[PDB]
């Protein structure tokens, strides 16, 4: 139905947890106060890309590394 761009204005910690990686990488937790929650990311979001980096079939660690690059634009899909 839709793909969405969720952009986080980083200060640093994002305030989210991910599961999955090499059947896709998914947001498993969003700290209520954290930057991710404030920016509109939601549990169940599947991360497709990070700042243009395709992470659809990324490793778990690869996804972590992409998220910790030095705004953080996340392309996500919800199933």
């Amino acid at each position: 139905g839709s793909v969405e761009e969720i952009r986080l204005p980083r200060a640093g910690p994002l305030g989210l947890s991910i599961v999955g990686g090499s059947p896709g990488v998914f947001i498993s937790k969003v700290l209520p106060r954290g930057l991710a929650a404030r920016s509109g990311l939601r549990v169940g979001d599947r991360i497709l890309a990070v700042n243009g980096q395709d992470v659809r079939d990324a490793t778990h660690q690869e996804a972590v590394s992409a998220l910790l690059r030095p705004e953080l634009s996340l392309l996500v899909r919800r199933d």
């Binding site: 910690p13 989210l16 991910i18 599961v19 498993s28 937790k29 778990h60 972590v64 998220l67 910790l68």
Partner: peptide, 7 residues
């Protein structure tokens, strides 16, 4: 069971 990483 499913590794979860805080970021």
């Amino acid at each position: 069971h499913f590794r979860e990483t805080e970021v």
